Coordinates of all heavy atoms in Angstrom, one line a residue:
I19 N 0.9 -1.3 0.0 CA 0.0 0.1 -0.1 C 0.9 1.3 0.0 O 0.3 2.3 -0.1 CB -1.1 0.0 1.1 CG1 -0.7 -1.1 2.1 CG2 -2.4 -0.3 0.6 CD1 0.1 -0.6 3.3
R20 N 2.1 1.1 0.3 CA 3.1 2.2 -0.1 C 4.2 1.5 -0.7 O 5.4 2.0 -0.9 CB 3.6 3.0 1.1 CG 4.0 4.5 0.8 CD 5.3 4.8 1.3 NE 6.3 3.7 1.5 CZ 6.8 3.2 2.6 NH1 6.3 3.7 3.8 NH2 7.6 2.2 2.6
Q21 N 4.0 0.2 -1.0 CA 4.9 -0.8 -1.5 C 4.6 -1.3 -3.0 O 5.5 -1.5 -3.7 CB 4.8 -2.1 -0.7 CG 5.9 -3.1 -1.0 CD 7.3 -2.9 -0.6 OE1 7.7 -1.7 -0.6 NE2 8.0 -3.9 -0.2
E22 N 3.4 -1.4 -3.2 CA 2.9 -1.5 -4.6 C 2.5 -0.1 -5.0 O 2.1 0.1 -6.2 CB 1.8 -2.6 -4.9 CG 2.4 -4.0 -4.7 CD 2.1 -5.0 -5.8 OE1 1.4 -4.5 -6.8 OE2 2.5 -6.1 -5.8
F23 N 2.3 0.7 -4.1 CA 2.3 2.1 -4.2 C 3.8 2.6 -4.3 O 4.1 3.9 -4.2 CB 1.7 2.8 -3.1 CG 1.3 4.2 -3.3 CD1 0.0 4.6 -4.1 CD2 2.0 5.3 -2.8 CE1 -0.2 5.8 -4.3 CE2 1.7 6.6 -3.1 CZ 0.6 6.9 -3.9
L24 N 4.7 1.7 -4.3 CA 6.1 1.9 -4.6 C 6.2 1.3 -6.0 O 6.9 2.0 -6.9 CB 7.0 1.1 -3.5 CG 8.2 1.9 -3.2 CD1 8.3 2.0 -1.6 CD2 9.6 1.2 -3.7
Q25 N 5.8 0.1 -6.2 CA 5.9 -0.5 -7.6 C 4.8 0.1 -8.4 O 4.2 -0.7 -9.2 CB 5.9 -2.0 -7.5 CG 6.4 -2.8 -8.6 CD 7.0 -4.1 -8.3 OE1 6.5 -4.8 -7.5 NE2 8.1 -4.4 -9.0
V26 N 4.6 1.3 -8.4 CA 3.6 2.0 -9.2 C 3.9 3.6 -9.3 O 3.6 4.2 -10.3 CB 2.1 1.8 -8.7 CG1 1.5 3.1 -8.3 CG2 1.4 1.1 -9.9
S27 N 4.5 4.0 -8.1 CA 4.8 5.4 -8.0 C 6.1 5.7 -8.8 O 6.6 6.9 -8.9 CB 5.0 5.9 -6.6 OG 4.1 6.8 -6.1
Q28 N 6.8 4.6 -9.3 CA 8.0 4.8 -9.9 C 8.0 4.2 -11.3 O 8.7 4.7 -12.2 CB 9.1 4.0 -9.1 CG 9.2 4.6 -7.6 CD 9.6 3.5 -6.6 OE1 9.8 2.4 -6.8 NE2 9.6 4.0 -5.4
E29 N 7.1 3.3 -11.6 CA 6.7 3.0 -12.9 C 6.2 4.3 -13.5 O 6.2 4.6 -14.7 CB 5.8 1.9 -13.1 CG 6.2 0.5 -12.9 CD 5.2 -0.7 -13.4 OE1 4.5 -0.3 -14.3 OE2 5.2 -1.7 -12.7
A30 N 5.7 5.0 -12.5 CA 5.0 6.4 -12.7 C 6.1 7.3 -13.3 O 6.0 7.7 -14.5 CB 4.5 6.9 -11.4
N31 N 7.1 7.7 -12.5 CA 8.1 8.6 -13.1 C 9.0 8.1 -14.2 O 9.6 8.8 -14.9 CB 8.9 9.2 -11.9 CG 8.6 10.6 -11.7 OD1 7.5 11.0 -11.6 ND2 9.8 11.3 -11.4
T32 N 9.1 6.8 -14.4 CA 9.8 6.2 -15.4 C 9.1 6.4 -16.6 O 9.6 6.4 -17.8 CB 10.1 4.7 -15.2 OG1 11.0 4.4 -14.1 CG2 10.6 4.0 -16.4
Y33 N 7.7 6.5 -16.5 CA 6.9 7.0 -17.6 C 6.9 8.4 -18.0 O 6.9 8.8 -19.1 CB 5.4 6.5 -17.4 CG 4.5 6.8 -18.4 CD1 4.2 5.9 -19.5 CD2 3.6 8.0 -18.4 CE1 3.3 6.1 -20.5 CE2 2.8 8.3 -19.3 CZ 2.6 7.3 -20.5 OH 1.6 7.6 -21.4
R34 N 6.9 9.2 -17.0 CA 7.1 10.7 -17.1 C 8.5 11.0 -17.7 O 8.8 12.2 -17.9 CB 6.8 11.4 -15.8 CG 8.2 11.6 -14.9 CD 8.1 12.9 -14.2 NE 9.0 14.0 -14.8 CZ 9.2 15.2 -14.5 NH1 8.3 15.8 -13.6 NH2 9.9 16.0 -15.1
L35 N 9.3 10.0 -17.9 CA 10.6 10.1 -18.3 C 10.8 9.7 -19.7 O 11.2 10.6 -20.6 CB 11.6 9.2 -17.5 CG 12.5 10.0 -16.6 CD1 11.7 11.3 -16.0 CD2 13.0 9.3 -15.5
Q36 N 10.5 8.5 -20.2 CA 10.8 8.0 -21.5 C 9.7 8.7 -22.5 O 9.8 8.6 -23.7 CB 10.8 6.5 -21.6 CG 11.8 6.0 -22.6 CD 12.7 5.0 -21.9 OE1 12.9 4.9 -20.7 NE2 13.4 4.2 -22.8
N37 N 8.5 9.3 -21.9 CA 7.7 10.0 -22.6 C 8.2 11.5 -22.9 O 7.9 11.9 -24.0 CB 6.3 10.0 -21.8 CG 5.3 11.0 -22.5 OD1 5.2 12.2 -22.1 ND2 4.6 10.5 -23.4
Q38 N 8.7 12.0 -21.9 CA 9.4 13.3 -22.1 C 10.6 13.2 -23.2 O 10.7 14.1 -24.0 CB 9.9 13.8 -20.8 CG 11.0 14.9 -20.9 CD 10.4 16.3 -21.3 OE1 9.9 16.5 -22.4 NE2 10.4 17.2 -20.3
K39 N 11.3 12.1 -23.1 CA 12.4 11.9 -24.1 C 11.8 11.8 -25.5 O 12.2 12.3 -26.5 CB 13.1 10.6 -23.7 CG 13.9 10.6 -22.5 CD 15.1 9.6 -22.4 CE 16.3 10.3 -22.0 NZ 16.0 11.5 -21.2
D40 N 10.7 11.2 -25.6 CA 9.8 11.1 -26.9 C 9.5 12.5 -27.4 O 9.8 12.8 -28.5 CB 8.6 10.4 -26.7 CG 8.8 8.8 -26.7 OD1 9.9 8.5 -26.4 OD2 7.8 8.1 -26.9
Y41 N 9.1 13.3 -26.4 CA 8.8 14.8 -26.7 C 10.0 15.4 -27.3 O 10.1 16.1 -28.3 CB 8.2 15.4 -25.5 CG 8.0 17.0 -25.8 CD1 6.7 17.3 -26.1 CD2 9.0 17.8 -25.7 CE1 6.5 18.7 -26.2 CE2 8.8 19.2 -25.9 CZ 7.5 19.6 -26.1 OH 7.2 21.0 -26.3
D42 N 11.0 15.4 -26.4 CA 12.3 16.1 -26.7 C 12.9 15.6 -28.1 O 13.4 16.4 -28.9 CB 13.4 15.9 -25.6 CG 13.0 16.5 -24.3 OD1 12.2 17.5 -24.4 OD2 13.6 16.3 -23.3
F43 N 12.9 14.3 -28.3 CA 13.5 13.8 -29.5 C 12.7 14.3 -30.8 O 13.4 14.9 -31.7 CB 13.4 12.3 -29.5 CG 14.1 11.6 -30.5 CD1 15.3 11.0 -30.3 CD2 13.7 11.6 -31.9 CE1 16.1 10.3 -31.3 CE2 14.5 11.0 -33.0 CZ 15.6 10.4 -32.6
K44 N 11.4 14.2 -30.7 CA 10.6 14.7 -31.9 C 10.8 16.2 -32.1 O 11.0 16.6 -33.2 CB 9.2 14.5 -31.6 CG 8.6 13.1 -31.9 CD 7.2 12.8 -31.3 CE 6.5 11.7 -32.0 NZ 5.7 10.9 -31.2

């Protein structure tokens, strides 16, 4: 509950990352 809210809060920022890279690249 802060642990799969760990294994989700970070898949979170990993998404806010490779998606931003997509933006920057384009």
Side-chain angles (χ1 to χ4, degrees):
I19 14 96
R20 209 228 32 245
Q21 180 77 327
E22 294 231 354
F23 193 83
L24 220 126
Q25 200 150 40
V26 116
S27 244
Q28 297 146 9
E29 281 192 39
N31 250 44
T32 290
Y33 180 86
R34 88 145 255 171
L35 250 37
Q36 220 125 343
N37 168 267
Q38 161 76 290
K39 292 200 132 25
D40 283 20
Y41 176 100
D42 290 347
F43 192 104
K44 279 174 160 141

